[PDB]
UniProtKB/TrEMBL annotation, chain B:
Family: Belongs to the RNA polymerase beta' chain family. RpoC2 subfamily.
Residues passing through the membrane, by range: none
Function: DNA-dependent RNA polymerase catalyzes the transcription of DNA into RNA using the four ribonucleoside triphosphates as substrates.
Subcellular location: Plastid, Chloroplast
Subunit structure: In plastids the minimal PEP RNA polymerase catalytic core is composed of four subunits: alpha, beta, beta', and beta''. When a (nuclear-encoded) sigma factor is associated with the core the holoenzyme is formed, which can initiate transcription.
Top-rank taxon: Eukaryota
The protein's name: DNA-directed RNA polymerase subunit beta''
Amino acid sequence: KGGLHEDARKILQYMTAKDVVPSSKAYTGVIEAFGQAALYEEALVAFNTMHEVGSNPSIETFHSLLYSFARGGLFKESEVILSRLVNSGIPRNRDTFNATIEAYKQGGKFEEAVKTYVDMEKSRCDPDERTLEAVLSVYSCARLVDECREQFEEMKASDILPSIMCYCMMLSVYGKTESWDDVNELLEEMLSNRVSNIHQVIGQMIKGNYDDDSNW
Amino acid sequence: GTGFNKGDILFYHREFC
């Protein structure tokens, strides 16, 4: 979780030095740590070693890789997992779909990203808050001001109070098109924000109010 | 006569591709 790959490697070596065969869950944590540090080579070694010791990967293991690949935009490796999930008897859950959108987005495949969101709704499922944030980053990245607006107000149309990440993406799409009117409109929303403290501080510090020694 | 003189590494370690 914290991305301490060095400590994770020492745990695995300590277990092996004591003739202890680590569990399938224990390796998945090691695979998680390497993906946090973008060490794909060492992550796939641990994935390979799981089959060697008989600790076959679980569904969570195929998610540690997908999120690790999603951050780097390695949709070629993401499709390998997806093509492996179908024949492994694992149906595509919502978490798998989020990583696919995130991987395609970071890889620059905007058309294939929205298609996954288009094909996701056909297969029913239930998009969560991150899925809306996953598809919002796609439209924000490809400078879609009107599409982002329709994505944003629907986030609050269900009384969800979108997180600070979605707010920062709105400032990007407005700042990319130099729409200084909408930037000031959204900043005032973050300035009051009586419910959430993180928006207020981050919104205030964007304008430069908190750029002092004591105010930092 | 005929009785004389007593008569897996490299597996699960492939390229992910």
